[PDB]
Amino acid sequence: SINFQDIPVRNVLQLIADYNGFNLVVSDSVVGNLTLRLDGVPWQQVLDIILQVKGLDKRVDGNVILIAPKEELDLREKQALEKARLAEELGDLKSEIIKINFAKASDIAAMIGGEGNVNMLSERGSISIDERTNSLLIRELPDNIAVIREIIE
Amino acid sequence: SINFQDIPVRNVLQLIADYNGFNLVVSDSVVGNLTLRLDGVPWQQVLDIILQVKGLDKRVDGNVILIAPKEELDLREKQALEKARLAEELGDLKSEIIKINFAKASDIAAMIGGEGNVNMLSERGSISIDERTNSLLIRELPDNIAVIREIIE
Amino acid sequence: SINFQDIPVRNVLQLIADYNGFNLVVSDSVVGNLTLRLDGVPWQQVLDI
């Protein structure tokens, strides 16, 4: 039951929203204007063909839908990835000791660390062995300590 | 039954659409204008000769057809490929252990990883062996872990 | 039976088309204009030359 000529994309999207569909929101200046007429069809096909040809991309948070251009979405993703990578690179390190029983600590230190950094499950720390008491002494990010501890337990 | 002189490509395409063919849509400023006259022929030959000589390219989503210049299509494809390659390059790694039975873990670690990175089925992780309990310890993207797990199972 | 002076290439090509030959189409601004006259010959030789 749709026929929109020289209607902004925001307005037709708000119509699709207010038509008993799940609530959706858009950006400030998202796409612009368009013109088309269709009826007697699912929202899936029409919405997707719009968002493919001229329309932008959309994401669902579980309940409601948001629309935006792909440029801002990819920019936000790249920002988040770079933030994660840099925060995991330059962090504050912590040092502590892990007690081992039923296995030799030298074998475990050779498996967790070892030759070269590509194999190592570490970034800019380091394992050492204490043979007298069968223990490991590790210096790394306080987030990698927990996964290492769970695995070697 | 077609004779269109100084008729925009959008208008003749909307005519071909409204002629009981499968619904089709175009971009904002796709091709432009043209002029030709033909009759008593299949839509396949006429549509293809138009889209070859001056017309642009088209894609079908299963039900309806979309038209656009080849430049935007190739640009979209290159964007998608670059996004996939960069996301698979710089991802967050995960580390976990795979238990092996009926085969030696050293042989399997030599087959899955091995000499050089070209042979390896990995990108910027790594296998290690734990001989005491016949196990592998892998650090890679949480998407490659599933295929590796299925194969070595 | 052809004699075209200052006739665009599009027009002589549409003539060769509408002369019971197989349908042909051209681009927007393909070649331009020309002038020549010939008769009693195959379409192959004239079209190719």
Three-class SS string for A17-34?
Answer: HHCCCCCEECCCCCCCEE
In 10 A of CB A113, how many CB atoms? Answer: 21
Q: Output the 3-class SS for chain A.
A: CEEEEEEEHHHHHHHHHHCCCCCEECCCCCCCEEEEEECCCCHHHHHHHHHHHCCCEEEECCCCEEEECHHHHHHHHHHHHHHHHHHHHCCCCEEEEEECCCCCHHHHHHHHCCCCCCCCCCCCCEEEEECCCCEEEEEECCCHHHHHHHHHC
Q: Between A and B, how many CB-CB pairs are < 8 A?
A: 48
CB pairs B-C closer than 8 Å? 10
Residue A42: count of CB within 10 angstroms of its CB: 8
- Which residues are CB-neighbours of B128 under 8 A, at least 6 positions away? A111, A112, A114, A119, B109, B136, B137, B138
Residue in chain A nearest B126 by alpha carbon: A119
Structural contact between residues A98 and A125, judged by C-beta atoms closer than 8 angstroms: no
| Element housing B97 (H / E) | strand B94-99
**What's the CA angle centered on A140, arms A139 and A144, to 5 degrees?**
135
Judged by CB atoms closer than 8 Å, whether chains meet at A114 and B96 is answered as no
Q: Under a CB-based contact definition with an 8 Å cutoff, are residues A20 and B29 in contact?
A: no
Count of beta carbons in the 10 Å neighbourhood of residue B65? 19
* Rounded (10°) CA dihedral A28, A33, A39, A41: -50
CA atoms within 13 A on the CB side of A16: 27
| Min distance A144 CA to chain B CA atoms (Å) | 10
- Pairing mode of beta strands A94-99, A57-60: unpaired
Q: Do B61 and A53 make contact, defined as CB atoms within 8 angstroms?
A: no
| Nearest 10 degrees: Cα torsion C11, C13, C18, C23 | -130
Question: Which conformational region is residue C40 in: left (phi greater than 0), alpha (psi within -120 to 50 degrees), or beta?
Answer: left
Count Cβ atoms within 10 A of the Cβ of residue A1 and give its class: 0-12 exposed, 13-18 middle, 19 or more buried.
exposed
Kindly give the interhelix angle for A144-152 and A105-112, rounded to the nearest 10 degrees: 130
Q: How distant, in Å, are the alpha carbons of A121, A129, B46, B54, B62 from that of B42?
A: 64, 80, 7, 19, 21
How far apart, in whole angstroms, are the C-alpha atoms of residue B110 and residue B94? 21
- Within 8 A of B130 by CB-CB distance, chain A residues are 107, 111
CB–CB contact A107 B68 (8 Å): no
Query: CB distance from C25 to chain B under 8 Å?
Result: yes
- CA atoms of B101 and B3, how far apart (whole Å): 74
Tokens of B18: 């409204």
| Residues 6 or more apart in contact with residue A105 via CB below 8 angstroms | A129, A130, A131, A134, A135, A136
> What span, in angstroms and rounded, lies between the C-alpha atoms of B81 and B86?
9
Q: What is the resolution of this structure in A?
A: 2.7
DSSP for B115-150? Answer: SSTTTSS-SS-EEEEETTTTEEEEEE-TTHHHHHHH
C2-8/C33-38 β-pairing:
antiparallel
Residue of C nearest to B41 (CA): C23
Question: Would you state the structure tokens that stand for residue B121, as one six-digit string?
Answer: 């089925």
What is the spatial distance between Cα B4 and Cα B124, in angstroms, rounded to a whole number?
59
Q: Torsions phi, psi of A74, nearest 5?
A: -65, -35
Contact between A136 and A83 under an 8 Å Cβ cutoff? The reply is no
Distance CA A19, CA A13 (A): 10
3-state secondary structure of B102: coil
Name the residue of chain B whose CA is nearest to A150's CA: B96
Single-letter residue type at B8: P
Nearest residue to B145 (alpha-carbon basis) of A88, B101, B89, B137: B137
**What does the alpha-carbon distance between residue B67 and residue B11 come to, in Å, rounded to a whole number?**
13
Which residues 32-61 of B are in CB contact (within 8 Å) with A? 61
Chain B partners within 8 Å of C31 (Cβ) = none
Bridging pattern class, strands B57-60 and B2-8: unpaired
CB proximity B11 to A under 8 Å: no
Retrieve residue B101's tokens.
């039975």
Query: Which two tokens mark B49?
Result: 């000769």
C29 interaction partners in chain B (CB closer than 8 Å) = none
Chains B and C touch (3+ CB pairs under 8 A): yes
Residue A85 phi/psi, 5-degree rounding, is: -65, -40
Q: Rounded distance, CA B153 to CA B136, Å?
A: 13
CA distance A76 to A145: 29
Report which residue type is found at B6: D
| C-alpha–C-alpha distance, residues B55 and B131, integer Å | 65
Asked if the C-beta of B129 comes within 8 angstroms of chain A's C-beta atoms, the answer is: yes
What is the number of residues in chain A?
153
Give the DSSP letter of residue B113.
S
**Residue A150: φ, ψ to 5°:** -65, -45
Element (H, E) at B7: strand B2-8
DSSP H helical segments within chain B, as ranges?
Answer: 9-18, 43-53, 70-89, 105-112, 144-152
Q: Is A106 on the interface with B (CB under 8 A)?
A: no
Distance of alpha carbon B88 from alpha carbon B124, whole angstroms: 10
Considering only the beta carbons, identify the residue of A49, A107, A114 that sits closest to B66: A49
Closest Cα of chain B to A61: distance in Å?
Answer: 21
The letter for the amino acid at B85 is R
Distance CA B120, CA A73 (A): 33
